[PDB]
Design a protein around this ligand. Sequence first.
Ligand SMILES: CC(=O)N[C@@H]1[C@@H](O)[C@H](O[C@@H]2O[C@H](CO)[C@@H](O[C@@H]3O[C@H](CO)[C@@H](O[C@@H]4O[C@H](CO)[C@@H](O[C@@H]5O[C@H](CO)[C@@H](O)[C@H](O)[C@H]5NC(C)=O)[C@H](O)[C@H]4NC(C)=O)[C@H](O)[C@H]3NC(C)=O)[C@H](O)[C@H]2NC(C)=O)[C@@H](CO)O[C@H]1O
Length: 129
Amino acid sequence: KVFGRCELAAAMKRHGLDNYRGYSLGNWVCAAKFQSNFNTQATNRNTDGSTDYGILQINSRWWCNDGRTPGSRNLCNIPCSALLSSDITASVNCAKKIVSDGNGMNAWVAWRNRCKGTDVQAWIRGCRL
Ligand SMILES: CC(=O)N[C@@H]1[C@@H](O)[C@H](O[C@@H]2O[C@H](CO)[C@@H](O[C@@H]3O[C@H](CO)[C@@H](O[C@@H]4O[C@H](CO)[C@@H](O[C@@H]5O[C@H](CO)[C@@H](O)[C@H](O)[C@H]5NC(C)=O)[C@H](O)[C@H]4NC(C)=O)[C@H](O)[C@H]3NC(C)=O)[C@H](O)[C@H]2NC(C)=O)[C@@H](CO)O[C@H]1O
Protein backbone atom coordinates (compact mmCIF):
# COMPACT_ATOMS: atom_id res chain seq x y z
CA LYS A 1 0.00 0.00 0.00
CA VAL A 2 1.14 3.53 -0.93
CA PHE A 3 -0.82 5.95 1.32
CA GLY A 4 -1.86 9.47 0.48
CA ARG A 5 -0.64 12.24 2.81
CA CYS A 6 -4.02 13.04 4.48
CA GLU A 7 -5.04 9.37 4.27
CA LEU A 8 -2.02 8.50 6.35
CA ALA A 9 -2.57 11.49 8.69
CA ALA A 10 -6.16 10.33 9.31
CA ALA A 11 -5.05 6.73 9.93
CA MET A 12 -2.27 7.88 12.26
CA LYS A 13 -4.77 10.14 14.11
CA ARG A 14 -7.42 7.40 14.44
CA HIS A 15 -4.67 5.17 15.79
CA GLY A 16 -3.66 7.81 18.41
CA LEU A 17 -0.36 9.30 17.13
CA ASP A 18 -1.45 13.02 17.18
CA ASN A 19 0.46 14.57 20.07
CA TYR A 20 1.61 11.14 21.20
CA ARG A 21 4.48 11.93 23.58
CA GLY A 22 4.03 15.58 22.52
CA TYR A 23 4.76 15.00 18.84
CA SER A 24 2.09 16.70 16.83
CA LEU A 25 0.71 14.74 13.88
CA GLY A 26 2.87 16.61 11.34
CA ASN A 27 6.02 15.10 12.81
CA TRP A 28 4.75 11.55 12.07
CA VAL A 29 3.67 12.33 8.55
CA CYS A 30 7.05 14.06 7.83
CA ALA A 31 8.97 11.05 9.16
CA ALA A 32 6.95 8.52 7.09
CA LYS A 33 7.42 10.57 3.89
CA PHE A 34 11.23 10.66 4.05
CA GLN A 35 11.62 7.11 5.42
CA SER A 36 9.27 5.15 3.10
CA ASN A 37 7.60 7.61 0.71
CA PHE A 38 4.34 6.48 2.42
CA ASN A 39 4.79 2.92 0.98
CA THR A 40 3.86 0.11 3.37
CA GLN A 41 6.00 -2.38 1.32
CA ALA A 42 9.27 -0.33 1.62
CA THR A 43 12.39 -2.22 2.75
CA ASN A 44 16.06 -1.14 3.06
CA ARG A 45 19.28 -2.89 4.07
CA ASN A 46 21.53 -1.44 6.75
CA THR A 47 25.33 -1.86 6.66
CA ASP A 48 25.15 -4.28 9.59
CA GLY A 49 22.75 -6.63 7.74
CA SER A 50 19.52 -5.55 9.43
CA THR A 51 16.57 -4.45 7.34
CA ASP A 52 14.09 -1.58 7.81
CA TYR A 53 10.41 -2.36 7.18
CA GLY A 54 7.26 -0.51 6.21
CA ILE A 55 5.87 2.99 6.30
CA LEU A 56 7.95 4.01 9.33
CA GLN A 57 11.05 1.99 8.36
CA ILE A 58 11.21 0.05 11.58
CA ASN A 59 14.66 -1.53 11.95
CA SER A 60 14.87 -5.33 12.44
CA ARG A 61 18.04 -4.63 14.48
CA TRP A 62 15.66 -3.73 17.38
CA TRP A 63 11.92 -3.97 16.73
CA CYS A 64 10.69 -6.94 14.63
CA ASN A 65 11.73 -10.48 13.63
CA ASP A 66 12.74 -11.39 10.07
CA GLY A 67 14.82 -14.54 10.78
CA ARG A 68 17.93 -13.03 9.16
CA THR A 69 19.32 -10.37 11.50
CA PRO A 70 21.52 -12.42 13.85
CA GLY A 71 21.95 -10.78 17.24
CA SER A 72 18.88 -8.54 16.82
CA ARG A 73 15.87 -7.83 19.05
CA ASN A 74 12.07 -8.04 18.46
CA LEU A 75 10.78 -5.38 20.89
CA CYS A 76 7.39 -4.96 19.20
CA ASN A 77 6.87 -8.79 19.15
CA ILE A 78 5.86 -9.04 15.53
CA PRO A 79 7.12 -10.57 12.31
CA CYS A 80 8.72 -7.81 10.27
CA SER A 81 6.45 -8.83 7.39
CA ALA A 82 3.44 -7.63 9.51
CA LEU A 83 4.89 -4.11 9.15
CA LEU A 84 4.39 -4.31 5.38
CA SER A 85 0.60 -4.78 5.63
CA SER A 86 -1.87 -2.33 4.13
CA ASP A 87 -3.29 -2.10 7.67
CA ILE A 88 -0.88 0.16 9.64
CA THR A 89 -2.06 -0.96 13.08
CA ALA A 90 1.11 -3.04 13.66
CA SER A 91 3.40 -0.21 12.52
CA VAL A 92 1.65 2.46 14.64
CA ASN A 93 1.48 0.28 17.73
CA CYS A 94 5.21 -0.44 17.29
CA ALA A 95 6.04 3.26 16.64
CA LYS A 96 4.42 4.23 19.95
CA LYS A 97 6.93 2.00 21.68
CA ILE A 98 9.92 3.34 19.62
CA VAL A 99 9.19 7.04 20.35
CA SER A 100 8.78 6.28 24.04
CA ASP A 101 12.22 4.55 24.19
CA GLY A 102 14.28 7.63 25.18
CA ASN A 103 15.32 9.54 22.09
CA GLY A 104 11.81 10.62 21.12
CA MET A 105 11.55 10.95 17.38
CA ASN A 106 15.37 11.18 16.98
CA ALA A 107 14.97 7.35 16.49
CA TRP A 108 13.95 8.24 12.94
CA VAL A 109 17.17 9.38 11.24
CA ALA A 110 15.13 11.10 8.53
CA TRP A 111 13.05 12.91 11.18
CA ARG A 112 16.16 14.35 12.88
CA ASN A 113 17.85 15.39 9.64
CA ARG A 114 14.83 16.57 7.70
CA CYS A 115 11.85 17.22 10.05
CA LYS A 116 13.15 18.38 13.42
CA GLY A 117 13.16 22.15 13.80
CA THR A 118 11.11 22.65 10.66
CA ASP A 119 7.51 23.74 10.25
CA VAL A 120 5.98 20.23 10.46
CA GLN A 121 2.33 21.35 10.73
CA ALA A 122 2.61 21.93 6.96
CA TRP A 123 2.50 18.11 6.51
CA ILE A 124 -1.18 18.06 7.61
CA ARG A 125 -2.14 21.18 5.72
CA GLY A 126 -5.62 20.79 4.23
CA CYS A 127 -6.46 17.53 5.99
CA ARG A 128 -9.91 16.94 7.42
CA LEU A 129 -8.87 15.74 10.83
C1 LIG B 1 21.23 2.87 6.48
C2 LIG B 1 20.33 3.68 7.37
O1 LIG B 1 20.57 4.88 7.56
N1 LIG B 1 19.30 3.06 7.96
C3 LIG B 1 18.33 3.75 8.81
C4 LIG B 1 18.15 3.07 10.16
O2 LIG B 1 19.34 3.22 10.90
C5 LIG B 1 16.97 3.67 10.91
O3 LIG B 1 16.59 2.84 11.98
C6 LIG B 1 16.99 3.37 13.24
O4 LIG B 1 18.28 2.86 13.47
C7 LIG B 1 18.87 3.37 14.64
C8 LIG B 1 20.25 2.73 14.78
O5 LIG B 1 20.15 1.31 14.83
C9 LIG B 1 17.99 3.08 15.86
O6 LIG B 1 18.49 3.91 16.89
C10 LIG B 1 18.75 3.17 18.08
O7 LIG B 1 17.55 2.82 18.72
C11 LIG B 1 17.77 2.19 19.96
C12 LIG B 1 16.43 1.66 20.50
O8 LIG B 1 15.55 2.69 20.87
C13 LIG B 1 18.47 3.17 20.90
O9 LIG B 1 18.66 2.52 22.14
C14 LIG B 1 18.06 3.25 23.21
O10 LIG B 1 18.83 4.39 23.58
C15 LIG B 1 18.17 5.12 24.60
C16 LIG B 1 18.81 6.49 24.74
O11 LIG B 1 20.19 6.33 24.95
C17 LIG B 1 18.21 4.29 25.89
O12 LIG B 1 17.65 4.93 27.02
C18 LIG B 1 18.65 5.57 27.86
O13 LIG B 1 19.62 4.71 28.40
C19 LIG B 1 20.61 5.46 29.09
C20 LIG B 1 21.95 4.72 29.13
O14 LIG B 1 21.83 3.40 28.64
C21 LIG B 1 19.98 5.76 30.45
O15 LIG B 1 20.89 6.38 31.34
C22 LIG B 1 18.78 6.68 30.23
O16 LIG B 1 17.94 6.67 31.37
C23 LIG B 1 17.96 6.39 28.96
N2 LIG B 1 17.61 7.67 28.37
C24 LIG B 1 16.36 8.07 28.15
C25 LIG B 1 16.22 9.42 27.53
O17 LIG B 1 15.37 7.39 28.44
C26 LIG B 1 17.43 3.01 25.64
O18 LIG B 1 17.59 2.13 26.72
C27 LIG B 1 17.91 2.30 24.38
N3 LIG B 1 16.96 1.24 24.07
C28 LIG B 1 17.26 -0.05 23.91
C29 LIG B 1 16.11 -0.96 23.59
O19 LIG B 1 18.40 -0.53 24.00
C30 LIG B 1 19.82 3.64 20.35
O20 LIG B 1 20.28 4.75 21.07
C31 LIG B 1 19.63 4.11 18.91
N4 LIG B 1 20.90 4.26 18.22
C32 LIG B 1 21.38 5.39 17.71
C33 LIG B 1 20.59 6.65 17.85
O21 LIG B 1 22.49 5.41 17.14
C34 LIG B 1 16.50 3.39 15.69
O22 LIG B 1 15.70 2.79 16.70
C35 LIG B 1 16.00 2.95 14.32
N5 LIG B 1 14.68 3.51 14.05
C36 LIG B 1 13.58 2.79 13.81
C37 LIG B 1 12.32 3.56 13.55
O23 LIG B 1 13.55 1.56 13.81
C38 LIG B 1 15.72 3.80 10.03
C39 LIG B 1 14.60 4.57 10.72
O24 LIG B 1 15.05 5.88 11.01
O25 LIG B 1 16.07 4.52 8.87
C40 LIG B 1 16.99 3.79 8.08
O26 LIG B 1 17.15 4.43 6.83
